[PDB]
């Protein structure tokens, strides 16, 4: 309570200092004395304080004789050093229940006013307490606004016990290949950019694996055109085992786990003349050689599906084509307007599996067209008519590639066609 010891609230910054009490950099400090009820100052920190405060200090302690609760005392001789006063508390002797509660109510007993505290860690001695409990009791009791605080050790292993108690164990990956377990400070946790699969996480649950979103992660996602939710899905789907198989001139993705929407899209694509942009052609040349894993996982993450779930083959072929060099120019049949078109044609009305069309804004009709450049075009829509070239048919929640002439990788019933490829010749 001495008025010269008061400092107005400030965010607490604890410091754990090495050597003995005489060493400390004081500042009108409250020096804590871990004592017995008779203030004999027998040994430990308590005798080191007693032979610092002087003999008149020790006589006044004998006057007041047995102490039941904490006692505040002037600092006597130690005032020269910057000690405003001395606070006496009786640690529990670490051999009784419950010692860590009494440890906690000992530090609570100490840290009550906004002052600079210097504290020998409680429970030293062979009659003492586990120092990890003491350091833990202290963080449980330390208020958040009580500025600079100094603990005092002389054990040189306690700087680790301290560092560990203020770190949380986090499992992280950039990969879903190698997983790394880290001990992070509440600062390191936010520097880690821990990602849940949905959102960033500033208190990780134990045992759970988090994506550490480095800048290499961000660049990889963007090379693949995925946000981070998608990128996580992508990394995990790379672990699915698939079988691919040369059949009908193309590498086919064996039916499994509702993946037909993928095989149908990739098989149409294989019967066009398009070339993927560099990042994606790298996945694709793996698939074409027997490593379907990355390319297929990219398909699922780009179209927001999970393996086992069944998706849209138009989604797939449109994803593939837009990541390629697909483009053509032409003139309309309705008014001979020149135009350019990249990606698939989405023929929303008047879809004709043997006559591809575009929408003319001028005449407000779905018109055929005469190509001036490019190699072909993919059209998507739905009609019951039959195609005469590479197409995709969808019926009864199954979908499959068919070249124009029966030539099928699935059934040969009546089915809507949902995508067709039209070469220009
Ligand atoms: Zn027109």
Residue numbers in the entry: 1 to 425
Provide the authors' own sentences about this structure as they appear in the paper.
Nonstructural protein 3 (nsp3), an essential component of the replication/transcription complex, is one of the most important antiviral targets. Nsp3 is essential for the formation of the RTC, and it functions as a scaffold protein by interacting with itself and other proteins (including viral nsps and host proteins).
Here, we first report the structure of PDCoV Macro-Ubl2-PLpro from δ-CoV with 2.5 Å resolution. The Macro-Ubl2-PLpro monomer consists of three distinct domains: Macro, Ubl2, and PLpro. Amino acids (aa 166-215) fold into a ubiquitin-like 2 domain, which lies in front of PLpro and is well separated from PLpro and Macro. The thumb, palm and finger domains form the catalytic core of PLpro, which has an extended right-hand architecture. The short BL2 in PDCoV PLpro causes the space for substrate binding to be much larger than the corresponding spaces of USP14 and other CoV PLPs. We determined that the active sites of PDCoV PLpro consist of Cys and His residues, similar to the active sites observed in many PLPs. Cys260 is located at the base of α9 of the thumb 3.6 Å from His398, which is situated at the base of the palm domain, while the third hypothetically conserved site aspartic acid (Asp412) is not well aligned with Cys260 and His298, the position of PDCoV PLpro Asp412 is quite inconsistent among other PLPs, and the possible explanation is that the Asp412 is located on the flexible loop connecting β19 and β20 (Figure 3(A) and Figure 6(A–C)). The SAXS profile calculated based on the monomer crystal structure is consistent with that in solution, while the profile calculated based on the dimer crystal structure is inconsistent, indicating that the protein is monomer in solution.
